[PDB]
């Protein structure tokens, strides 16, 4: 990450440039797996019998 001064405009406003450089690499295919179609809105109805 880097921060650089760019200058002051005629409205007396100073500008700063912020930049972050990055990337991602997967060296072998078997290092990553994904499970799809996961449903998160289902709740179980359990029978109850109270004293």
């Amino acid at each position: 990450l880097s921060v650089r001064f760019m200058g002051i405009n005629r409205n007396a406003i100073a500008s700063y440039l912020i930049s972050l450089y990055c990337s991602l690499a997967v060296l072998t295919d078997d290092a990553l797996a994904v499970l799809d179609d996961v449903e998160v809105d289902k709740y179980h109805d359990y029978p109850v019998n109270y004293k």
Partner: protein
Amino acid sequence: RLNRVNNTDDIQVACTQRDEATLPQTFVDYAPEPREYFLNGVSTVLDVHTRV
């Protein structure tokens, strides 16, 4: 050489408020052809007799 400023009324400054208003641009100008002062001489020749 006596240099001088010749745009006294064109040097613009602004009184600022609590806002993001634009600011004036300005510069100071000099007289293109200033007066140059040159020394004058008061001189005389004095004669003295060698015998005296």
